[PDB]
Design a protein around this nucleic acid. Structure first.
Lengths: 1340, 58, 618
RNA sequence: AGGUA
């Protein structure tokens, strides 16, 4: 039992015990990259697959082949911390073993000579962090997993557009993993067409002609032969009694010598059964029935070889007479039924203009490339490379398995390139679907959509890099020497590394990690994107993909997605879902034996799920997996229904498996509207970390899992006893049974403190443990941002009352007590970044100095002698941080300026001020200063000081580690020395460093003493080499981009408090803006006198359907009542027994609760620890759909000595008169979103204009004005608003002359305008004239 | 030379990896005198003219 | 590509014609503000008006140069703040919503300096902006020149735009909290303190309520002087006793002189308050209407706060028959499924029957819930119990029309009923649970489809409405009122519309504000009650109702003989006034906006067998 | 790119 749990036990409701612990929430990314990077002894995902696919590379003449052996990952030159500090990527060098082999020159193959290049460096690949992220430019980036149509065959239905004919059609698309798409589509004329990619359709038989198939061969492979024996008169035919279905009697149906069905009759099942039981062999048929038939193959004369019949023509009297007289006896016709295989292939062959492979190749080559005279070799090469080139066309394992699955083959593996048999099978399946025998497949079923995680995308991009470097290598093998030359000189690392960096850094699916919550990071790493390269563009809607499909159940969270124009495209992966081996989504299900529901699990994929019937997680089971309902609700084929308890095959593992972490963290989700729950889940990711991040009273139980699994929490890798606690360091003495052989020593955890996140929010870790605390693996040593006691603590729990209050909470607004700002809660810390670059201009190199010409001495005060502000100095907007100056160029002076300089005796300064000022509107303390001067450029004093600081920090860390290790070494040295003759009297009084100067007689003890002396020397060398290695990193400068001499980074920490205008919300989706912070007295207060911290508009509940917030408020009353009672007991300090009894009763209170009770804790210390942790309230865990009921909430409220109805009458603050009827009060978890009003102001009257236009916009310090778009112009035109419109258009927007004249007039105190002409219109005129078009302005 | 070897980039490229805003939409016109400075120049011209009027003729 | 753009030409109009002297910030409620003013943060006011501050500082001579004034304003000394107050005092500023659907999306207000960082917006105006305080950001523009200041004060002002341009009924209508307060103040109980008292003036009513000697609502006889606009426009003071409630008298204190007391002596929902404002505007004018609207806002907020109206967990009382109805409907659908296996009923007929059974069950459950919540109060008047309107809060927000309709409360307290799955087909088995009895996993997964469809529909319909209103603006761009009158007896035959079997839009509403094209006679005698072509205001509509004429010829804009524009008469009167349109007004743009703005609200036996006339007539 | 209305 975790000691972290011992410190605070969250009361968990829920009547159905979970049998499957929550999976490691980041398993997707970690497993993806492990598959990408780990060695494979066989062809498997990752670098190995790409290398074995592209290697060996064969030379274009020369017999000089490059063969692959293996790859090795070099250890990164910089760790994560220094990578973030220095702004460089966290990457590992890639080194590959290769061999150049030269065969017999020139003769059949066989090696003559071979040379080996070992560990050749062909680029650096970003290495994955332990948090599941990558560091690329000092910013921690995340690669979102992509949901894309799986390689294979999709038999889609074409509907809604019918070529003005109706009769919706079918089309089969072969989507390769890499290569060209293939399409087999139908037309309303019942003809089949082939499209390579999306070019012009060709008749479908052309591909078969190119595949070297005769017309008779095609007809045999597709249609069924019908045997016609030339006997009696005008032939008889061999009739299968099963063949005649849905046909009319146009021919006498004879059997046993007599006709059973006469011509003109309707053939039913009775006649069919009679014929089958009578076993009709052959029947005589009239020639009229024959005249509509089609001959399958060719027929020549049997005595003179004259052609009289060929493949695929209709039959007629003359042809029948010719074939009868020629000497034939057997005629093979085509079976053509309008319900069975129809006249599709026959008519397609009729449309076919080609009859041979060569013409098919010509047609393919001309449709793929317009014109382009069809050279036979070129056409053959194009056709072969389109579908049969392993380096140009590939399906991969997933594609092959889907290909065989849709064609119903027991094979699940095979060659990536297509074969003729596969194409023919695809045609047969599509034709059967056209006949109605087959069924279409959704392109939205999760079985047809595969997830490319980080590893697969990286491997594909690395394969592209290998392809381009393969082109380079193949060019070089013939351009370069055809004999011995070292292969490292012919491999180019620039393209592969550059492309890999392009993928990881600048891509649609490589995003800055949304880093303001542990939940935000978890959601971003679990995000599933339908966009990106190879996915879906935003040109969609396209409702199908955006809509939630029934297969998403338990695989993708249905209620978490952005509300922008990408809704239903950016999903979040469910809590329990994991990627299948083939990349599909599989979810765990408890295997259900007919009678007993077993505890064993099976991860069912999407397609496998439909076969079985799956029971809902709400099913009530007593004892060992026995249902209490004979008919239980389940889902089998995507439709929910009641099934008897003896046919169920699987059950949901947990009630929370149908949502993601963000959705799962919302309490009483079962009581909320899906729209508003979606809004709440989306906003929960935007919570800003809070300085006092305590806990949510009403949790869901995923708080601990989310906090632990995210990287923001320092978790003890190996258990033991806490040896040292510090705000920056935590040192753990590992347990005896957990240390490696020899001296493994201590485990040190450096706590990340006050570091800029990607949202300019502070992320620091505070130690939540103390000295001597026993910790074990998986314990929370340090609580990260928005995390306390190992629980996820985004927002804060606050007392809220649902009532209108003088209209200040009017739309969705929140009213907030002054106690909130007084308690300094919801007060966030924003660490923003400022960069001042001293560059090298052609006017002269810029420099950083304290002395700035023509500036106030206050600016000089805050800087050192190096021109850099002191760390910890308080600065405001406009203050100078870095004393940059730029060599001033030539100066032009107006006559008045010349007169003034002549008068005052002053002259132009040779250097202009370019110092970095604080942008106006922000304040705060300079907490950190970074100085980056490139190697080869002289260092300044401040950089030397910073390097010395970090050097001594590393030195202190190393010295602490070394002194602990050497203290252990000296202790064991004394232990050895005391043995073999008592030498403990003098040794005990001697310094531990003088303990190796005592000799001993020749023995095992003496040899051990010598070995330990050698170990001491080795430890000294280890310390020296470690210090040297880290000093090399510290001392060396950062190789910056050319042009910048130095970079000065300054961190500003703004303690930004909550104020009116800030956006604040709840978990359930209730939103709003804080209207006014009233004084504490004005708050309505209860009878006891506690004023309510927050007042919410109650009218927002019954229309937003989110009653769950009311239940959360009531449960908050219950929790805080238990907390108040336990706090009163603690102040009264009754005894251990009373507090233990009360806590036990509180945990017991419920119904079929799986909480588990005490005593299993310590008698006194743990009881008081729990009491101190709960005095602020007992946290309650409400599972997502196994949550607490109203009866349980009311019982818990009764335990808290609180009104059962959850409503207390409140006395107004202004009038001191109680409101009529009670009002709902309670402790609700409220969130401060990252939409602070301080960031939302921008205002300008003068500033950034533009180059091409004069529209005012630009600047991250002062932005442009507000876009007065066409909507607002219409709004003004609607009124008689003319002069205001003209101001919007000319004076303040684009008329530079008018703008200056207006500014001068307003300063002078005059209000009138020059209409002028906006510069935008002059730009328009000049640009129209730039074409061959005249445009002018004409007077009357 | 390494700085020279790189070619200029278009403003039509989106800033921030396919944001619907272009790079050139942010470029400030540095060849335009600020209206603050223009008003300062006008006031200085007026003051110099007044002062010259305060002196003798020649 | 640089010329061709979307939407429209980029640099000229969109995107986007950026403007100077503008700011932007999050908006909050302004419940103390007057209608003609809005709260503007001090920092935005200082930054916006820097040239004005410089001008006034140099005017009073506190700075010898513009640079010195800049130093003074960046130091933000207390001196510049008085200058700022002076320049703000008269200067109006334009407030703009991020999307602009109709001309009310930009309105002038007098800025009031506030410490803080968010724009305080008048609560009445947020309805016009379609702005809810959930992080919405509004922009502020400064009309610089004197002509623009005047132009904003005359036209841009909120008080000048109390009526929607698409319909005469007011757009500044009390919406949710103030409506709830008014409803609680006017809704009567069956027993409370101080019933049967006799009072003179509503002042005694307020005294009794504030002293706690009576209840906010209780049947009381009060002597009140109502003023009637009669004779030629002269107030007629009539003092007599009315049987009303204390809250109603307290409200009547607010109501300006000139309105009948009957307007407030009733339960007041959203419709009642909107009608009362419309009557006040039609009878009194503009200034009394604005003052009365502000006063009613203040009164509603105050008495809503004093109400203590709260939504608990108990104020969604589950109807007692929910389980019975659900079990019954389950029995019939089980019987129908069993009969389907017998082959007696076809699959389509079985599906239709099941859907109808579940619909009937849903209607029964909703009716039982509404009966339970509506008359939940059974308290005795003096000892005899009686069934009257419930004090239940959710029923107050449902009935007053503040927020949440009957369908809304139906998903909360009853059962949320049928919904649809992909392919848009209604699901066979509906949701038998509501939000007070938490939905299970599968039913929530079902509801997710409806949620996704709703959200995608909202997005696509918003885009389509934007494109539509753009096209309407394009076609109606150049149209403007150029003549006061053209002279034409043409027009359209104008009648109350009857589609199906019943009238859904009467003659008066369709003809109100129109000009006559023919002097239509009475339905009986051949008497002209409407003179030659003239504007039809409320009095003429009442006259037409009294002598009900079937049809009226009305001069439409289409039949106007004016070229390069339309004559004033052929248009009508509608704008923000009951008077005829003014020459020069751009009717094309206002019409395009009026038709475009509600586009976001658009998300879309006995018939043909035997005609059954519902009423008795010729 | 992500997020807000």
């Amino acid at each position: 039992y975790s000691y972290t749990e011992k410190k605070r036990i969250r009361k968990d409701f829920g009547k159905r015990p979970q049998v499957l612990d929550v999976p490691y929430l980041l398993s997707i990314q970690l497993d993806s990259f492990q598959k990408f990077i780990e060695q494979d002894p066989e062809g498997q995902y990752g670098l190995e697959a790409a290398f074995r696919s592209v290697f060996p590379i064969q030379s274009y003449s020369g017999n000089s082949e490059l063969q692959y052996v293996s790859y090795r990952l070099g250890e990164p030159v910089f760790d994560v911390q220094e990578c973030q500090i220095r702004g460089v990527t966290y990457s590992a060098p890639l080194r590959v073993k290769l061999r150049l082999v030269i065969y017999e020159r020139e003769a059949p193959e066989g090696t003559v000579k071979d040379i080996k290049e070992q560990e050749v460096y062909m680029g650096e690949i970003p290495l994955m962090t332990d948090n599941g992220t990558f560091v690329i430019n000092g910013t921690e980036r995340v690669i979102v997993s992509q949901l894309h149509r799986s390689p294979g065959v999709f038999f889609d239905s074409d509907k809604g557009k019918t070529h003005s004919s109706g009769k919706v059609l079918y089309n089969a698309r072969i989507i390769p993993y890499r290569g060209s798409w293939l399409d087999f589509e139908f037309d309303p004329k019942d003809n089949l067409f082939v499209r390579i990619d999306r070019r012009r359709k060709l008749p479908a038989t052309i591909i078969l002609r190119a595949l070297n198939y005769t017309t008779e061969q095609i007809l045999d492979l597709f249609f069924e032969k019908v045997i016609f024996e030339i006997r009696d008169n005008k032939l008889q035919m061999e009739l299968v009694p099963e063949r005649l279905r849905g046909e009319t009697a146009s021919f006498d149906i004879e059997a046993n010598g007599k006709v059973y069905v006469e011509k003109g009759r309707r053939i039913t099942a009775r006649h069919i059964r009679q014929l089958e039981k009578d076993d009709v062999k052959l029947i005589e048929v009239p020639v009229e029935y024959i005249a509509g038939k089609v001959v399958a193959k060719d027929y020549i004369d049997e005595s003179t070889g004259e052609l009289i019949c060929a493949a695929n023509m209709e039959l007629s009297l003359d042809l029948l007479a010719k074939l009868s007289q020629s000497g034939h006896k057997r005629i093979e016709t085509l079976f053509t039924n309008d319900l069975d295989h129809g006249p599709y292939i026959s008519e397609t062959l009729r449309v076919d203009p080609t009859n041979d492979r060569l013409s098919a190749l010509v047609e393919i080559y001309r449709m793929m490339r317009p014109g382009e005279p069809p050279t036979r070799e070129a056409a053959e090469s194009l056709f072969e490379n389109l579908f049969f080139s392993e380096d140009r066309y590939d399906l991969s394992a997933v594609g092959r398995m889907k290909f065989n699955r849709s064609l119903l083959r027991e094979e699940i593996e095979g060659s990536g390139i297509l074969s003729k048999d596969d194409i023919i099978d695809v045609m047969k399946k599509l034709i059967d679907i056209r006949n109605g025998k087959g069924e279409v497949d959704d392109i939205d079923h999760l079985g047809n959509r595969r997830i490319r995680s980080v590893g697969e995308m990286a491997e594909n991009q690395f394969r592209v890099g290998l392809v381009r470097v393969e082109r380079a290598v193949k060019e070089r093998l013939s351009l370069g020497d055809l004999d011995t030359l070292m292969p490292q000189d012919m491999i180019n690392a620039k393209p592969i590394s550059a492309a890999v960096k392009e993928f990881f850094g600048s891509s649609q699916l490589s995003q800055f990690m949304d880093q303001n919550n542990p939940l935000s990071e978890i959601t971003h790493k679990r995000r599933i994107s339908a966009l990106g390269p190879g996915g879906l563009t935003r040109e969609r809607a396209g409702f199908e993909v955006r809509d939630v499909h029934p297969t998403h159940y338990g695989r993708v969270c249905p209620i978490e997605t952005p509300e922008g124009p990408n809704i239903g495209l950016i999903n979040s992966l469910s809590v329990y879902a994991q990627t299948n081996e083939y990349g599909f989504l599989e979810t765990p299900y408890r295997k259900v034996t007919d009678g007993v529901v077993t505890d064993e699990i099976h991860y069912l994929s999407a397609i496998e799920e439909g076969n079985y019937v799956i029971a809902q997680a709400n099913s009530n089971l007593d004892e060992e997996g026995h249902f209490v309902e004979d008919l239980v609700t389940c889902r089998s084929k995507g439709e929910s229904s009641l099934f008897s308890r003896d046919q169920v095959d699987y059950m949901d593992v947990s009630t929370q498996q149908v949502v993601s972490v963000g959705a799962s963290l919302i309490p009483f989700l079962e009581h909320d509207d899906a729209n508003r729950a979606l809004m709440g889940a989306n906003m929960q990711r935007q919570a800003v970390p809070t300085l006092r991040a305590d806990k949510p009273l009403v949790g869901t139980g995923m708080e601990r899992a989310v906090a632990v699994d995210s990287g923001v929490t320092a978790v003890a890798k190996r258990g033991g006893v806490v040896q040292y606690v510090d705000a920056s360091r935590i040192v753990i003495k590992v347990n005896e049974d957990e240390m490696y052989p020899g001296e493994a020593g201590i485990d040190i955890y450096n706590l990340t403190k006050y570091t800029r996140s990607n949202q300019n929010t502070c992320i620091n870790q505070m130690p939540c443990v103390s000295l001597g605390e026993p910790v074990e693996r998986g314990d929370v040593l340090a609580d990260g941002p928005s995390t306390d006691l190992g629980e996820l603590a985004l927002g804060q729990n606050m007392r809220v009352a649902f009532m209108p209050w003088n209209g200040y909470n009017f739309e969705d607004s929140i009213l907030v007590s002054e106690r909130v700002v007084q308690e300094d809660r919801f007060t966030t810390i924003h660490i923003q970044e400022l960069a001042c670059v001293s560059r090298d201009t052609k006017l002269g190199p810029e420099e950083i100095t304290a002395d700035i010409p023509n500036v106030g001495e206050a600016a000089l005060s805050k800087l050192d002698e190096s021109g850099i502000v002191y760390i910890g100095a308080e600065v405001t907007g406009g203050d100078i941080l870095v004393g940059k100056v730029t060599p001033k160029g030539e100066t032009q002076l107006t006559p008045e300026e010349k007169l003034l300089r002549a008068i005052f005796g002053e002259k132009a300064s040779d250097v202009k001020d370019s110092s970095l000022r604080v942008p106006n509107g922000v304040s705060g303390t300079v907490i950190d200063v970074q100085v980056f001067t490139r190697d080869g450029v002289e260092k300044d004093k401040r950089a030397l000081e910073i390097e010395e600081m970090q050097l001594k920090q590393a030195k202190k860390d190393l010295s602490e580690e070394l002194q602990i290790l050497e203290a252990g070494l000296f202790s064991r040295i004394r232990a050895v020395l005391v043995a073999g003759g008592v030498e403990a009297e003098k040794l005990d009084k001697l310094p531990r460093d003088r303990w190796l100067e005592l000799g001993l007689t020749d023995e095992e003890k003496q040899n051990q003493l010598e070995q330990l002396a050698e170990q001491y020397d080795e430890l000294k060398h280890e310390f020296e080499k470690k210090l040297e290695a880290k000093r090399r990193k510290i001392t060396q400068g950062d190789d910056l981009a050319p042009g910048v001499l130095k970079i000065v980074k300054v961190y500003l920490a703004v303690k930004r408090r909550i104020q009116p205008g800030d956006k604040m919300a709840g978990r359930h989706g209730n939103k709003g803006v804080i209207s006014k912070i009233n004084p504490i007295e004005d708050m309505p207060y209860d009878e006891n006198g506690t004023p309510v911290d927050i007042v919410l508009n109650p009218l927002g509940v019954p229309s937003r359907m989110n009653i769950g917030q009311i239940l959360e408020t009531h449960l908050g009353m219950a929790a805080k009542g238990i907390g108040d009672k336990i706090n009163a007991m603690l102040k009264q300090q009754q005894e251990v027994a009373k507090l233990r009894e009360f806590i036990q009763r509180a945990y017991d209170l419920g119904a079929d609760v799986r909480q588990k009770v005490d005593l299993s804790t310590f008698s006194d210390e743990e009881v008081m620890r729990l009491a101190e942790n709960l005095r602020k309230g007992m946290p309650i865990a409400t599972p997502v759909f196994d949550g607490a009921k109203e009866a349980e909430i009311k019982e818990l409220l009764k335990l808290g000595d609180l009104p059962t109805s959850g409503q207390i009458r409140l006395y107004d603050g202004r009038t001191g008169e109680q409101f009529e009827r009670p009002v709902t009060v309670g402790y609700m978890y409220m969130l401060k979103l990252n939409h602070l009003v301080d960031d939302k102001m921008h205002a300008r009257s003068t500033g950034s204009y533009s180059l091409v236009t004069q529209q005012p916009l630009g600047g991250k310090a002062q932005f442009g004005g507000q876009r007065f778009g066409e909507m607002e112009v219409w709004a003004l035109e609607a009124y008689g608003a003319a002069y205001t419109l003209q101001e919007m258009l000319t004076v303040k927007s684009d008329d530079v002359n008018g703008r200056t004249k207006m500014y001068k007039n307003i300063v002078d105190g005059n209000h009138q305008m020059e209409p002028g002409m906006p510069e935008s219109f002059n730009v328009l005129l000049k640009e129209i004239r730039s074409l061959g078009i005249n445009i002018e302005l004409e007077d009357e | 030379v390494l700085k020279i070897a790189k070619e200029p980039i278009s403003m039509e490229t989106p800033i921030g990896d396919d944001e619907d805003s272009h790079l050139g939409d942010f470029i400030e016109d540095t060849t335009l005198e600020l209206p603050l400075d223009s008003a300062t120049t006008e006031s200085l011209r007026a003051a110099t003219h007044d002062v010259l009027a305060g002196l003798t003729a020649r | 590509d640089m010329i061709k753009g979307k939407q429209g030409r980029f640099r000229q109009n969109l995107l986007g014609k950026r403007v100077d002297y503008s700011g932007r910030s999050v908006i909050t409620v302004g419940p103390y503000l007057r209608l003609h003013q809005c709260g503007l943060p001090k920092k935005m006011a200082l930054e916006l008006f820097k040239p004005f501050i410089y001008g006034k500082l140099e005017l009073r001579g506190l700075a010898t140069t513009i640079k010195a004034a800049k130093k003074m304003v960046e130091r933000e000394e207390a001196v510049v703040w008085d200058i700022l107050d002076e320049v703000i005092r008269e200067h109006p500023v334009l407030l703009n919503r991020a999307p602009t659907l109709h001309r009310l999306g930009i309105q002038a207000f007098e800025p009031v300096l506030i410490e803080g960082k968010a724009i305080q917006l008048h609560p009445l105006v947020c309805a016009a902006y379609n702005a809810d305080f959930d992080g919405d950001q509004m922009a502020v523009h400064v009309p610089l020149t004197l002509e623009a200041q005047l132009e904003a004060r005359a036209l841009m002002m909120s008080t000048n735009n109390i009526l929607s341009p698409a319909n005469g009924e007011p757009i500044i209508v009390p919406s949710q909290d103030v409506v709830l307060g008014l409803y609680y103040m006017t809704r009567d109980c069956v027993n409370a303190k101080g019933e049967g008292m006799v009072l003179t003036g509503p002042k005694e009513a307020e005294r009794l309520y504030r002293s706690g000697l009576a209840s906010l609502h209780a049947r009381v006889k009060v002597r009140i002087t109502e003023y009637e606009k009669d004779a030629n426009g002269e107030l007629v003071a009539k003092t007599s006793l009315k049987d009303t409630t204390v809250g109603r008298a307290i409200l009547w204190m607010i109501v300006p002189k000139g309105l009948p007391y009957s307007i407030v002596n009733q339960a007041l929902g959203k419709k009642a308050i909107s009608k009362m404002l419309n009557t006040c505007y039609r009878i009194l004018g503009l200034k009394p209407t604005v003052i009365f609207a502000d006063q009613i806002m203040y009164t509603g907020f105050a008495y809503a706060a004093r109400s203590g109206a709260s939504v608990g967990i108990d104020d969604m009382v589950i109807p007692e028959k929910k389980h019975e109805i659900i079990s019954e409907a389950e029995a019939e659908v089980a019987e129908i499924q069993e009969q389907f296996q017998s082959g007696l009923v076809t699959a389509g007929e079985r599906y239709n029957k099941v859907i109808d059974i579940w619909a009937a069950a849903n209607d029964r459950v909703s009716k039982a819930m509404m009966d339970n919540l509506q008359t939940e109060t059974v308290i005795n008047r003096d000892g005899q119990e009686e069934k009257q309107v419930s004090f239940n809060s959710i029923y107050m927000m449902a009935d007053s029309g503040a927020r949440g309709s009957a369908a809304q409360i139906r998903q909360l307290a009853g059962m949320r009923g049928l919904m649809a799955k992909p392919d848009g087909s209604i699901i066979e088995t509906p949701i038998t649970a509501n939000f007070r009895e938490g939905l299970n996993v599968l039913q929530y997964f079902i509801s997710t489809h409806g949620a996704r469809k709703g959200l995608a529909d909202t997005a696509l319909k918003t885009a389509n409405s934007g494109y539509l209103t753009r096209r309407l603006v394009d076609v109606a761009q150049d149209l403007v009122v150029t003549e006061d009158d053209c002279g034409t007896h043409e027009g359209i035959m104008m009648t109350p519309v009857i589609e199906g079997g019943d009238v859904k839009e009467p003659l008066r509403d369709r003809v109100l504000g129109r000009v006559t094209a023919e002097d239509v006679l009475k339905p009986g005698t051949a008497d002209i009650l409407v003179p030659r072509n003239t504007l039809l205001h409320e009095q003429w509509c009442d006259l037409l109702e009294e002598n009900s004429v079937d049809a009226v010829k009305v001069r439409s804009v289409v039949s106007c003989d004016t070229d390069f524009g339309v004559c004033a008469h052929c248009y009508g009167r509608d704008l923000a006034r009951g008077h005829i349109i003014n020459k020069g007004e751009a009717i094309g743009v206002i019409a395009a906006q009026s038709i475009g703005e509600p586009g976001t609200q658009l998300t879309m036996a006995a018939a043909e067998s035997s005609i059954q006339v519902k009423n008795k007539g010729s």
